[PDB]
Structure 1
Amino acid sequence: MTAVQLIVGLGNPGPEYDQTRHNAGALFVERLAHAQGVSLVADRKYFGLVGKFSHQGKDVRLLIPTTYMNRSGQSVAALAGFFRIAPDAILVAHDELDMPPGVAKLKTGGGHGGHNGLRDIIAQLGNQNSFHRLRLGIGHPGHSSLVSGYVLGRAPRSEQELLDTSIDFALGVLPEMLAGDWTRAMQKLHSQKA
């Protein structure tokens, strides 16, 4: 019923953060943008890289913030603000510690689950958590004190391959995601085994 107008892929900027676990969301958008032949334009006005393509008469935008992970909302709020976009027309792809590599799922609203990027977004939007989330599994290190370094590290070859499989499964349900039909999008996704 509500078309997706903005896709956001979270990550940290700089070479020392590239290809790391924390940048799964950004990688998804980066791969989604390449499949569509969309160009990511550096725009200081919105604090990140912006992309645009049409789908059913409406403009769908792609965004990778270039502020830090914890100031991401600023960028999201800057773009949603200028284009008057409702929170529920927004999909944010991100790394999810709670599921293992090779697994991806969808979710509407909810907590930020300690994720600092998600958390700034809810704040900057005026406490709107009503948006959508593509959760790309990266696995858990086993303990809470090891989390900060685990997400800021590059994964072994076997693990990346599973993530690569999951980003592929996800683009596979893009037609269903752009339309905003989440129950089918979930039904087609949630049953793919890596």
Structure 2
Amino acid sequence: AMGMKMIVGLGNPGTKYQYTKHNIGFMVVDKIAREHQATFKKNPFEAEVAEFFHNGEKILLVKPQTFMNESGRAVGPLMTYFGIYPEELVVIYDDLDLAVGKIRLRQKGSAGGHNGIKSIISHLNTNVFDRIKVGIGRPEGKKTVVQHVLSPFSKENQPLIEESMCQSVKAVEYLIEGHSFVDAMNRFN
């Protein structure tokens, strides 16, 4: 297996969570959908799945609907459903260790305390897979981590988060146009 076939954006289902930091993965793949104008359908593997085409090939966008900490429960089986492997995966999600307005691309690494990534590592039996970390900043003021990730972005940070979602979409476009992930790392890191 080689070549990107699936982009997973992490987050929690429901209107309550739709603008919270921990749903930044949902937001990016939503943006990627609208700029491919593509359609998300409920899927039996506890996910919303959209499909679009580039040249003659299918690219899938996935929003697990399990809640964050059980994301792998959707992603592992869904990936088996389409016959795809961790090498063909890109996961997009929120990174506390990155400032709002920044993104980082990585090929591997531990969950580092992110329980959605922990679930995907568990269900895939590897921590080697491409990912786009979208900065959500360290917890602001006196908030706990959970209060921080389960709350919206501040007015100050809204233009910065829009910039980093634009950059995340540009990185994905770069991948869809055929550049390698190493190439994308050189360009966006």
TM-score using structure 1 length: 0.90
CA contact (8 A) 1:2 1:180 kept: no
Post-superposition Cα deviations, 1:107-146, rounded to whole Å, max 9, x if no partner, equal 0111011101011111111x22111110000100269981
Give the partner amino acid of 2:135: G
* 2:49 paired with 1:50: yes
Going from structure 1 to structure 2, the CA distance change for 1:86 and 1:117 (only over 3 Å counts) comes to same
* Residue in structure 2 matched with residue 151 of structure 1 by the alignment: 149
* 2:163 paired with 1:165: yes
Going from structure 1 to structure 2, the CA distance change for 1:53 and 1:189 (only over 3 Å counts) comes to same
Aligned to 2:51, the other structure's residue is in SS state strand
Gaps of 5+ in 1: none
* 2:139 paired with 1:141: yes
CA contact (8 A) 1:170 1:189 kept: no
Post-superposition Cα deviations, 1:5-53, rounded to whole Å, max 9, x if no partner, equal 000000101122120000001100000000001000112x111110111
Gaps of 5+ in 2: none
Aligned to 1:168, the other structure's residue is in SS state helix
Deviates more, 1:154-163 or 1:135-144: 135-144
CA contact (8 A) 2:140 2:148 kept: no
Whole-Å Cα distance in 1 between the matches of residues 173 and 149 of structure 2?
30
Going from structure 1 to structure 2, the CA distance change for 1:4 and 1:138 (only over 3 Å counts) comes to same
* Residue in structure 2 matched with residue 131 of structure 1 by the alignment: 129
5 Å-filtered alignment, 1:89-104, equals 89-104=88-103
* Residue in structure 1 matched with residue 35 of structure 2 by the alignment: 35
- Identity fraction in percent: 33
Whole-Å Cα distance in 2 between the matches of residues 145 and 53 of structure 1?
39
C-alpha RMSD of matched pairs (Å): 1.9
Alignment length (residue pairs): 188
TM-score using structure 2 length: 0.93
Give the partner amino acid of 2:169: L
Give the partner amino acid of 1:4: M
